[PDB]
Structures are given as structure tokens and as C-alpha cells.
Amino acid sequence: DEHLCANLMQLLQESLAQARLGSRRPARLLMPSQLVSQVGKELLRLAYSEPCGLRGALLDVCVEQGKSCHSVGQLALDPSLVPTFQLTLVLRLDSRLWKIQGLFSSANSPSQSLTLSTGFRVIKKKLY
Template identity: 85%
Template sequence: MPGLWDRFSSSSSRPSSPEQPQQPPAWATAARGEGLGRCASLESSDCESLDSRHSSFGPEEETEYPDEASLPDLELLSDPEDEHLCSSLMQLLQETLSQARLGSKRPARLLMPAQLVAQVGKELLRLAYSEPCGLRGALLDVCVEQGKGCHSVEQLAVDPSLVPTFQLTLVLRLDSRLWPKIQGLFSAGPSSFAPGFSQSLSLSTGFRVIKKKLYSSEQLLIEEC
């Protein structure tokens, strides 16, 4: 899994927190393995339909927070380290999406509009504010909606040396105006694209973030933007 804490710490003079044991406990390893399969297993059109019965962390409920009042004002939660980490994370996310493959062997360069980059970064900071290690403790699963399901793109660990404390599933959406032209990207048949071909696709500014704490059995928190 790509990580960016080393990238950040090498350019920062801030002292880092003590290193955690290199071998995470079994529950953390299980959570990492569960993450990449989460979006791939969503077969319905509702990507929020996560079956908590298959979770090793006990029953959980899905709660929607339709207004921004449910989370504190970001200006009151400013943390220079988290802000730098978030900036690096967004760069890594854009690089990852630019090399994504949707469906079976179909290359696609997914582009994040500037507005989407800003909104996602803001939401990730909001969701990390109450965590003991802040954004460093995040495990980010990146998914893209494709028709009635979700395609898992990548799992990103902000700090691979740290046992993750919470898991974020970022569900992005393709611009709906492009759908008639791109349905072939998700088919399993032989590719009609020439070798080396990469199609650029713009993402919608709408997205969803699902937060799951890995150290408690609290209910899921779903942020839809």
C-alpha cells in the first residue's frame, strides 16, 4: 500500500511520534485485507449498503449526516501537521487515480476537478479531528462508482509504520454526462483500445466518505457531498 508519512517526515522538522511495533495485531491485519474487498463486493446501486454482519467488529449502524453542523468548524481544528499530510495525501490520490484501471484491463486516467480536491481534503480533515493520531492513523480505500456497483482503485496508508486507528472509504463518481461513452470500460470482453491507450475521464464533484473506527464498535459515519 502506498504511504506518504515518510515523504512528509523527511521534509518536516517536526519531531515524529515514537514508532509503533512493526507487526500490527491480527485485527488490524484483518481490517487492511477487508478494506480493498469492501467496494469490490458492493453489487447494488447503493454504495452505502455495507453488510455489517460480515464485519469482525460487531454490529454497526449506518448514520447519515446531511448537514455540516454535525462536525466541528474546520477552522477551529487547524493542525499544521495534518494539513501538510492532507496536502500530500491529495497529491498521492490524484497520482493514483491518474493510473487507474477500470474494469478488466481498461486503462483510464481519472481527473479530479480542483473543487473536488478541495472538498475531499476538507472532509478528510474533519473526519480525522477526533482521532488519537489524527490523519496519520487513517487507512483510505479509494473506490469509483460504476453503474450498480463500485470499483476498488487502491488502498492508501498515510503512515504504514503506524497501526491504523480508523478506516475511510472514499467513493468517487464519474461525471454522469460521460456514462454513455464509457460503459465499455467496465465490460469484461476484449479491449478495443490500442496498447498504451489511456482515456482521460473527469470525476464528478459529488462523493461519499464512509468512516469506520478500528478500535471500537461505534456506528459508521457517512458523509455525502
């Protein structure tokens, strides 16, 4: 499942690069190189005790922003299988990186990226 997971990490970063956390305004969220590695490792660890391994997983991603927890997206890891377990990935964005843009920001220069924390959680639950 290692190549499946590597590819998933790529899809995840593409997703986070245009994340919407509570509004329509996308934010360019970046995963530290270490986070990508640790996340992948843990997803794999949790999946190997399941039928079909990581292929049977439904990945559920959210980003912690202070007290809030924003849903980023959800993905069945293999289109030809019905997911039988859910992996909830909880990432974190330091709240100083968090403001309101205004209605007249067109001539503003492109937003900078925001790098996510190295801390995260993964929770697995069987689906029925």
C-alpha cells in the same frame, strides 16, 4: 495534518490517473479542482476526532460506475503507525464517460482523460 492531506491528494490523483475499473485497462481519471479541495477538507474533518489524526487513517478508495462500485486501492497514511480507523472515499464517474476496446487497438491514438463527478461520500469506521 494539512500538509499530510495535501500530499495525500497528490498521491490519490496519481493513483486515479491509471485506475483500473473492472478490467486490466487503465483509465485516466481526473479530479476537478473543487473535488480535491472538498475531499481533503472532509477527510481532515473526520480524522481530527481520532488519535494520531489523519496519520492513523487507512484510506479506502472506490469509484461508482453506474450501479457498480469499483475498488481503486487502499493506503495507510503513515507507514510508522498502525491504522486505527478507515476512511472510505466514494467517488463517482458519470456513466456516459464509461467501451470494450477490442484486440486490435495498438494503432489507436492514446485514450482521452475522464473527469470525475464533484459528488462524493466519505464513511469513517473505527478499526479493531
